[PDB]
């Protein structure tokens, strides 16, 4: 409580860590890379937990947590097969980092 | 190897291949079983496909 | 040789083509073998099996008819390119895409292919309440500003008929479609299917001219390409080809000389005035019963063709 | 119904050179029961090349997808409108296909020697339509750039017009074509009079056309097309000569007007065959004759 901010090139509205990661994700993106901050900034994942809590708990359940990524390739690519990946994230319930 | 005028925090993500344990009690759902169906789907002439 | 009459026995005797009846009311076994068809689906037993006869070679026989089997085209897509909201018989758009190896296909239903002619730039109202964002279709298609450009855009996109099946999956959506043969869907009961085209994309072309009526009435889907974005548009005719290509270079006679005074052709690939091609055939008298198509919020027109049979074929140019 | 063709005619090399093709196809001479082995595909025809007798014998002729081949016997399928069939792309110039895109068959122009099994046995070319008319064009343009630099060398330069016929281009797959480098003058190669047909039929298109325009716009106005279409030409192809011999400008007009609709049928790919579900793990594709 007692500052706004730890830094004011990513928390700002058009700051920094806004405009070079956070635009709308998309499955079919051309470069379709997997920027793993991407679930912090994202506005409409900010506000996607926005919903009460057990109507939380079944959308984590129930399907694939957002942004995730895809295992047992050489670079971690975003999923796009979504088909025989199974994987739990608190990342995009969260919303924190260790 | 100078400091720049700025500092970075780097952020990854990591895979933890788990192995987890599903529990579930007794009776929870009642699950409905229809009985199968075969049809044939594509028929060229070699081969069947049912 | 005397086997021999033993395998032509089993060979000889089609189907009864006439059968003297009586009554009605009797229902004889004679015309009960003629009316009835081999099923397609049955119970996963070796009665069922045996008494549907699908183990049959070549066609349905218990232990050739005019009829043939349809093929279905088996198309991966992406979840949020495809509204899982759709009618089960709308006709699609295969987008070949610029890839080497993609495993992952692009296909467009009518309503998705006009959001990407709208935006640069009633039906639209339900085109942009069933898929919100334009720009999560406008990178299926790479470069679609420079395809438009050199009006290459009618030899990358093909037909592929009406779909059938859409399971209702999370992140890769199958969806099952004829590209050929006879329509009919493949449910356990087993119900039509009726090709749902919107009705402001679907111009009639028999009633736009106002004696002897064919049977087939083929549908024409044709792109042609507008100052105001390219169009999809659809057209139902009783006529052959030849015919066609003909009626609608006079019914696009106005939009040609629309499009020459607004822009100057500069170049020499600006001249191709887009292509048609014939989705196949239907019957000519109960065709194109009108009806709706509800969504949660709003419901446009929409055109029902009953009973298709999808034939699609190349592009034909209209200049 | 019988589908099945058994011609009767081997050993270990052709037993190994027939097994690799057990999915391509070739045409036959009858859709009868057994046959000769000259009846086989594409053997009376190539042997001096020429594409349009080759075309006319491809889609004259019916054709047939092989299954087997035996020491003595090649069990083969003939493909008939009315059901579906399966094959293969094991061919010698390798495109790859694609699902849902129309399959043609065009007579082999790249090399005798790349598409054939010698005992004799020609396989025609099994390739998607894009590509079909992309390499027909590249052909075609290779054969008059390489006659008009062995007729004046000034006029191209060699590698001028190998930057762009020396490849192909569909859907990120950029292929490369064998072009005969020494095609040797007066015809006497493969595609030697298709480009003779489409000069022609080229040089009396205007000729044509100002007979046509002239012939037209006295029967006053059934449309605005008629007169709209005047100012898109040049004027200069549109003054040119306008008087000549009427018997040879009526012998000028129908000799084009026959190369023009050979040339159109044979621009029309051929036998299009319609694919509905390739697999390139299984490199089989599930077509029918359309």
Redesign the interface.
């Known amino acids: 409580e007692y500052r706004s901010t730890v830094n004011p090139?990513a928390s700002q509205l058009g700051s920094l860590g806004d405009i070079m990661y956070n635009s709308?994700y998309?499955?079919?993106?051309?470069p379709g890379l997997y920027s793993?901050?991407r679930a912090?900034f994202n506005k409409e994942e900010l506000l996607r937990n926005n919903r009460g809590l057990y109507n939380m708990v079944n959308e984590y359940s129930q399907?694939?947590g957002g942004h995730p990524?895809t295992?047992n390739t050489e670079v971690?690519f975003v999923?796009?097969?979504?088909?025989d990946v199974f994987?739990e994230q608190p990342?995009s319930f969260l919303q924190e980092?260790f | 190897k100078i400091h720049p005028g700025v500092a970075m925090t780097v952020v990854r993500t990591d895979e933890i291949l788990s192995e987890n344990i599903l529990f579930s009690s007794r009776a929870s759902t009642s699950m409905f079983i229809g009985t199968p169906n075969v049809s044939r789907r594509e028929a060229r002439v070699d081969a069947v496909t049912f | 040789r005397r086997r021999l009459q033993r395998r032509i026995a089993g060979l000889l005797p089609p189907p009864a083509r006439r059968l003297n009846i009586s009554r009605g009311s009797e229902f004889t076994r004679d015309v009960r073998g003629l009316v009835e068809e081999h099923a397609q689906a049955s119970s996963l037993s070796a009665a069922a099996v045996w008494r549907a006869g699908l183990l049959a070679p070549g066609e349905v026989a218990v232990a050739w008819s005019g009829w043939r089997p349809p093929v279905f085209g088996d198309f991966l897509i992406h979840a949020s390119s495809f509204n899982n909201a759709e009618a089960t018989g709308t006709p699609l758009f295969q987008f070949k895409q610029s890839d080497p190896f993609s495993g992952v296909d692009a296909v467009f239903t009518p309503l998705s292919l006009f959001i990407l002619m709208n935006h640069g730039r009633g039906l639209t109202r339900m085109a942009n309440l069933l898929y919100d964002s334009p720009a999560t279709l406008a990178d299926l298609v790479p470069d679609f500003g420079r395809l438009v450009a050199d009006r290459r855009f009618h030899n990358f996109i093909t037909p592929v008929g009406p779909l059938v099946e859409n399971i209702k999956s999370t992140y890769l959506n199958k969806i099952t479609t004829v590209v050929h043969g006879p329509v009919v869907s493949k449910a356990i009961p087993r119900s039509t299917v009726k090709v749902t085209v919107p009705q402001e994309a679907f111009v009639d072309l028999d009633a736009w001219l106002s004696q002897p009526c064919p049977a087939d009435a083929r549908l024409y889907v044709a792109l042609t390409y507008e100052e105001a974005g390219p169009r999809f548009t659809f057209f139902q005719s009783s006529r052959g080809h030849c015919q066609i290509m003909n009626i609608l270079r006079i019914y696009y006679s106005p939009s040609i000389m629309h499009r020459y005074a607004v822009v100057q052709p500069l170049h020499i690939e600006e001249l191709t005035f887009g292509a048609v091609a014939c989705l196949g055939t239907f019957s000519a008298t109960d065709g194109w019963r009108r009806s709706a198509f509800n969504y949660r919020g709003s419901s446009l027109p929409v055109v029902e063709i009953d009973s298709f049979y999808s034939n699609v074929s190349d592009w034909e140019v209209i200049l | 119904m019988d589908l099945k063709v058994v011609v009767s005619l081997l050993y270990t090399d052709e037993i190994a050179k027939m097994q690799q093709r057990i999915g391509c196809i070739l045409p036959l001479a009858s859709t009868h029961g057994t046959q000769n082995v000259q009846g086989l595909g594409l053997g009376q025809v190539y042997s001096v090349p020429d594409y349009v007798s080759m075309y006319n014998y491809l889609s004259d002729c019916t054709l047939a997808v092989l299954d087997e081949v035996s020491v003595d016997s090649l069990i083969l399928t003939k493909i008939v409108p009315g059901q579906t069939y399966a094959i293969k792309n094991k061919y010698q110039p390798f495109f790859q296909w694609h699902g849902t895109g129309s399959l043609s068959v065009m007579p082999p122009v790249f090399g005798r020697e790349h598409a054939t099994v010698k005992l004799d046995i020609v396989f025609p070319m099994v390739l998607p339509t894009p590509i079909a008319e992309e390499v027909l064009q590249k052909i075609l343009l290779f054969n008059v750039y390489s006659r008009v630099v062995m007729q004046a060398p000034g006029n191209a330069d060699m590698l001028d017009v190998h930057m762009h016929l020396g490849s192909v281009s569909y859907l990120g797959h950029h292929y490369e074509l064998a072009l005969p480098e020494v095609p040797g003058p007066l015809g006497l190669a493969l595609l030697d009079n298709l480009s003779l047909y489409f000069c022609i039929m080229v040089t009396l298109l205007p000729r044509a056309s100002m007979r046509l325009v002239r012939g037209l716009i006295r029967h006053e106005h059934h449309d605005l097309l008629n007169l709209f279409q005047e100012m898109v030409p040049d004027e200069i192809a549109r003054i040119d000569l306008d008087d000549l011999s009427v018997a040879d400008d009526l012998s000028r007009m129908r000799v084009m007007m026959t190369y023009l609709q050979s040339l159109a049928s044979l621009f029309n790919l051929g036998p299009r065959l319609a694919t509905a579900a390739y697999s390139q793990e299984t490199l089989t594709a599930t077509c029918w004759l359309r």
């Open positions: 090139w709308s998309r499955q079919t993106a051309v793993p901050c912090f399907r694939l990524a295992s971690q999923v796009i097969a979504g088909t994987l990342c980092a």
